Amino acid sequence: HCDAATICPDGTTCSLSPYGVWYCSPFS
């Protein structure tokens, strides 16, 4: 998970992209 080396905003989730990027969104 991205909660030990990224810490996404409150109420947001991060997912890996087919390119190799990590981003979080407040809308799942």
Residues present in the chain in total: 28
> Dihedral through CA 3, CA 8, CA 13, CA 19, nearest 10?
-90
- Residue 1: which domain range? 1-28
> What is the experimental method?
NMR
Task: Please state the φ and ψ torsions of residue 26, each to the nearest 5 degrees.
Answer: -80, 20
Residue partners of 21: CB distance under 8 A and separation at least 6: none
Q: What is the DSSP string of 1-28?
A: --TTTT-PPTT-EEEE-TTS-EEEETT-
Cross-strand pairs, 22:
16
Could you report how far apart the first and last alpha carbons of the chain are, in Å? 14
Domain count, the chain: 1
> Dihedral through CA 11, CA 14, CA 15, CA 20, nearest 10?
160
> CA angle 7-23-4, nearest 5°?
25
Residue with tokens 């979080």: 24
13: which 2 tokens? Answer: 């989730």
